[PDB]
Amino acid sequence: TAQYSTSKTPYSPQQDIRTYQPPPPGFTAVFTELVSRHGSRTPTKIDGADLLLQLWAKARDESELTSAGQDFGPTMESYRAAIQKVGLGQETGRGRQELQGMADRMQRRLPELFEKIKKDATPIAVVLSQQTGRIADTAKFFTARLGATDPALAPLIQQPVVDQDLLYFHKTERGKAYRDYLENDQRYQETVKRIKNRDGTREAATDILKTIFTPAFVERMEPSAVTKAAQALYDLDAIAPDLSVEGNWHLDRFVPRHAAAWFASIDDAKSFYKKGPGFEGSDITFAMASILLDDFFKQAEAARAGKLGADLRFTHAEEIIPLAALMQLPGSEKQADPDEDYTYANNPWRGASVSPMAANLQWDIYRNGTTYLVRMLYQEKEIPFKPDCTPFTPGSHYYRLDELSRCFGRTAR
């Protein structure tokens, strides 16, 4: 969907659902549960577009524009207007499409389950991090899709409730130790300063601006201004795919690919330490997410009682990223050696794969007799659990629920 957008990468499901593993003989879907980031969105701040527009205007007035720079003013004005029409930090039309596709594949993947839910009249729960905004709209896209397809399901979908400890823990008191770490830990702060002062930023920043402005114009700017405007342009280039329904402004014209890759790698490095697996032997960045892993288990165990048909949760990257680090999901299994800073070369973690827009985790809970199995979807790819969890059969993506409780330390056996 996009090559160097790290956590702005628009959502694409990572496996065709016709190629999921079939459930073992006589097992049937009895419960499913989901946590999802919001869909694609606009930038939360318009200030970078304006800095660039003001910068472009001065250069226009001085006749210091490149040939392609001529169309920057018109392009960015159009982009900015489209952003403001949707509203800053709001779901785009692509975010709507992302969540509708998730609902579609969920209903197509578990048709027997929704048959049961209607048959039992059990509720489908909708839980949010916040009452309003792009989180609430994200949920609504999904649930109105469930109901447009299956109008007999609609009266069973509950009204949304907010659980900030479960779905907003980086802001609640659950994240207090975490936030104090970001603010005061000297190893962390020095590592982020090291990332920020990587040699390369200045050259990539000048390469970005040189698509629009003459090199003499660039040289007249203050160096810190060069970096700030280039960061802004790259950020806006990076999120442009989120607005694909609203337009195509061809912003790659102004952000050379090697420079895009450079800024992407800086963002991933910072995000790895701030929100991802971070340093070897420390869980400071993701232990807060235990409440969310807990709930995936609690709800699955509670399916036995049969009072809930499904559980749909909606949240931010700041919950999904630590949930993945905590479960050691693919891409989040390698913490950093304090003596070897994260790079693309030595670590598989990437914003774009761990936490694109609408990044989501789903568990399908199957039942035969009183045996309960779980199958995990991550970005709708069927994935194994961490390797000390034993699958139901050799090579299976299905796991005994009491195996998962055991291997996650929740029970002894």
Side-chain angles (χ1 to χ4, degrees), residues 64-77:
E64 301 283 0
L65 290 172
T66 70
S67 158
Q70 303 272 131
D71 191 50
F72 187 79
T75 297
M76 185 57 55
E77 280 185 34

PDB file of all heavy atoms in Angstrom, residues 64-77:
ATOM      1  N   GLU A  64      13.191  31.064  -7.044  1.00  0.00           N
ATOM      2  CA  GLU A  64      14.155  30.056  -6.613  1.00  0.00           C
ATOM      3  C   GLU A  64      13.521  28.671  -6.580  1.00  0.00           C
ATOM      4  O   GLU A  64      13.882  27.824  -5.753  1.00  0.00           O
ATOM      5  CB  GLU A  64      14.744  30.405  -5.249  1.00  0.00           C
ATOM      6  CG  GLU A  64      15.470  31.744  -5.204  1.00  0.00           C
ATOM      7  CD  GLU A  64      16.851  31.728  -5.836  1.00  0.00           C
ATOM      8  OE1 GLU A  64      17.307  30.670  -6.337  1.00  0.00           O
ATOM      9  OE2 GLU A  64      17.493  32.800  -5.814  1.00  0.00           O
ATOM     10  N   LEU A  65      12.586  28.436  -7.487  1.00  0.00           N
ATOM     11  CA  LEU A  65      11.866  27.179  -7.576  1.00  0.00           C
ATOM     12  C   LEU A  65      12.454  26.312  -8.682  1.00  0.00           C
ATOM     13  O   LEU A  65      12.837  26.809  -9.743  1.00  0.00           O
ATOM     14  CB  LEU A  65      10.383  27.437  -7.853  1.00  0.00           C
ATOM     15  CG  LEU A  65       9.512  28.059  -6.763  1.00  0.00           C
ATOM     16  CD1 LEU A  65       8.136  28.410  -7.317  1.00  0.00           C
ATOM     17  CD2 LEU A  65       9.391  27.123  -5.575  1.00  0.00           C
ATOM     18  N   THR A  66      12.521  25.011  -8.433  1.00  0.00           N
ATOM     19  CA  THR A  66      12.800  24.105  -9.526  1.00  0.00           C
ATOM     20  C   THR A  66      11.594  24.052 -10.465  1.00  0.00           C
ATOM     21  O   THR A  66      10.500  24.535 -10.154  1.00  0.00           O
ATOM     22  CB  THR A  66      13.119  22.709  -9.006  1.00  0.00           C
ATOM     23  OG1 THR A  66      11.931  22.123  -8.466  1.00  0.00           O
ATOM     24  CG2 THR A  66      14.187  22.759  -7.934  1.00  0.00           C
ATOM     25  N   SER A  67      11.796  23.417 -11.617  1.00  0.00           N
ATOM     26  CA  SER A  67      10.709  23.251 -12.575  1.00  0.00           C
ATOM     27  C   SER A  67       9.544  22.462 -11.965  1.00  0.00           C
ATOM     28  O   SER A  67       8.384  22.885 -12.042  1.00  0.00           O
ATOM     29  CB  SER A  67      11.258  22.586 -13.839  1.00  0.00           C
ATOM     30  OG  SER A  67      10.235  21.947 -14.567  1.00  0.00           O
ATOM     31  N   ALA A  68       9.832  21.324 -11.329  1.00  0.00           N
ATOM     32  CA  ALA A  68       8.776  20.603 -10.614  1.00  0.00           C
ATOM     33  C   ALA A  68       8.286  21.370  -9.374  1.00  0.00           C
ATOM     34  O   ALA A  68       7.112  21.265  -9.010  1.00  0.00           O
ATOM     35  CB  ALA A  68       9.257  19.199 -10.239  1.00  0.00           C
ATOM     36  N   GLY A  69       9.147  22.158  -8.728  1.00  0.00           N
ATOM     37  CA  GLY A  69       8.698  22.980  -7.616  1.00  0.00           C
ATOM     38  C   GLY A  69       7.568  23.934  -7.968  1.00  0.00           C
ATOM     39  O   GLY A  69       6.828  24.359  -7.071  1.00  0.00           O
ATOM     40  N   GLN A  70       7.418  24.283  -9.255  1.00  0.00           N
ATOM     41  CA  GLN A  70       6.335  25.171  -9.668  1.00  0.00           C
ATOM     42  C   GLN A  70       4.982  24.636  -9.223  1.00  0.00           C
ATOM     43  O   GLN A  70       4.109  25.402  -8.803  1.00  0.00           O
ATOM     44  CB  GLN A  70       6.351  25.351 -11.185  1.00  0.00           C
ATOM     45  CG  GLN A  70       7.649  25.884 -11.757  1.00  0.00           C
ATOM     46  CD  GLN A  70       7.692  27.381 -11.771  1.00  0.00           C
ATOM     47  OE1 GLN A  70       8.663  27.998 -11.336  1.00  0.00           O
ATOM     48  NE2 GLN A  70       6.625  27.990 -12.290  1.00  0.00           N
ATOM     49  N   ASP A  71       4.790  23.328  -9.300  1.00  0.00           N
ATOM     50  CA  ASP A  71       3.497  22.737  -8.985  1.00  0.00           C
ATOM     51  C   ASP A  71       3.358  22.357  -7.510  1.00  0.00           C
ATOM     52  O   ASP A  71       2.307  21.847  -7.117  1.00  0.00           O
ATOM     53  CB  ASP A  71       3.247  21.516  -9.886  1.00  0.00           C
ATOM     54  CG  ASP A  71       1.802  21.001  -9.818  1.00  0.00           C
ATOM     55  OD1 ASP A  71       0.858  21.799  -9.961  1.00  0.00           O
ATOM     56  OD2 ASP A  71       1.612  19.782  -9.592  1.00  0.00           O
ATOM     57  N   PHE A  72       4.361  22.648  -6.681  1.00  0.00           N
ATOM     58  CA  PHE A  72       4.268  22.318  -5.262  1.00  0.00           C
ATOM     59  C   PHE A  72       3.203  23.148  -4.556  1.00  0.00           C
ATOM     60  O   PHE A  72       2.419  22.618  -3.761  1.00  0.00           O
ATOM     61  CB  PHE A  72       5.608  22.519  -4.566  1.00  0.00           C
ATOM     62  CG  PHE A  72       5.603  22.034  -3.150  1.00  0.00           C
ATOM     63  CD1 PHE A  72       5.731  20.679  -2.871  1.00  0.00           C
ATOM     64  CD2 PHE A  72       5.434  22.920  -2.092  1.00  0.00           C
ATOM     65  CE1 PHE A  72       5.698  20.226  -1.574  1.00  0.00           C
ATOM     66  CE2 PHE A  72       5.410  22.470  -0.799  1.00  0.00           C
ATOM     67  CZ  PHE A  72       5.538  21.113  -0.542  1.00  0.00           C
ATOM     68  N   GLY A  73       3.208  24.464  -4.770  1.00  0.00           N
ATOM     69  CA  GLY A  73       2.220  25.330  -4.155  1.00  0.00           C
ATOM     70  C   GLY A  73       0.803  24.852  -4.428  1.00  0.00           C
ATOM     71  O   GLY A  73       0.031  24.578  -3.503  1.00  0.00           O
ATOM     72  N   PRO A  74       0.436  24.742  -5.713  1.00  0.00           N
ATOM     73  CA  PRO A  74      -0.899  24.211  -6.045  1.00  0.00           C
ATOM     74  C   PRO A  74      -1.175  22.839  -5.458  1.00  0.00           C
ATOM     75  O   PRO A  74      -2.287  22.600  -4.968  1.00  0.00           O
ATOM     76  CB  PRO A  74      -0.893  24.165  -7.585  1.00  0.00           C
ATOM     77  CG  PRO A  74       0.147  25.118  -8.003  1.00  0.00           C
ATOM     78  CD  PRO A  74       1.187  25.157  -6.913  1.00  0.00           C
ATOM     79  N   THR A  75      -0.198  21.923  -5.500  1.00  0.00           N
ATOM     80  CA  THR A  75      -0.429  20.577  -4.982  1.00  0.00           C
ATOM     81  C   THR A  75      -0.714  20.618  -3.489  1.00  0.00           C
ATOM     82  O   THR A  75      -1.711  20.059  -3.020  1.00  0.00           O
ATOM     83  CB  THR A  75       0.780  19.668  -5.247  1.00  0.00           C
ATOM     84  OG1 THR A  75       0.983  19.511  -6.650  1.00  0.00           O
ATOM     85  CG2 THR A  75       0.554  18.288  -4.638  1.00  0.00           C
ATOM     86  N   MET A  76       0.168  21.274  -2.726  1.00  0.00           N
ATOM     87  CA  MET A  76       0.039  21.254  -1.279  1.00  0.00           C
ATOM     88  C   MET A  76      -1.203  22.000  -0.824  1.00  0.00           C
ATOM     89  O   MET A  76      -1.825  21.605   0.165  1.00  0.00           O
ATOM     90  CB  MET A  76       1.304  21.827  -0.646  1.00  0.00           C
ATOM     91  CG  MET A  76       1.345  21.746   0.864  1.00  0.00           C
ATOM     92  SD  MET A  76       1.160  20.065   1.496  1.00  0.00           S
ATOM     93  CE  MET A  76       2.485  19.183   0.650  1.00  0.00           C
ATOM     94  N   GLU A  77      -1.596  23.066  -1.534  1.00  0.00           N
ATOM     95  CA  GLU A  77      -2.841  23.745  -1.197  1.00  0.00           C
ATOM     96  C   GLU A  77      -4.028  22.801  -1.358  1.00  0.00           C
ATOM     97  O   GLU A  77      -4.923  22.760  -0.505  1.00  0.00           O
ATOM     98  CB  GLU A  77      -3.009  24.998  -2.066  1.00  0.00           C
ATOM     99  CG  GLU A  77      -2.183  26.195  -1.555  1.00  0.00           C
ATOM    100  CD  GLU A  77      -2.434  27.463  -2.338  1.00  0.00           C
ATOM    101  OE1 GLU A  77      -3.577  27.667  -2.797  1.00  0.00           O
ATOM    102  OE2 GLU A  77      -1.485  28.254  -2.501  1.00  0.00           O
TER     103      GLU A  77
END
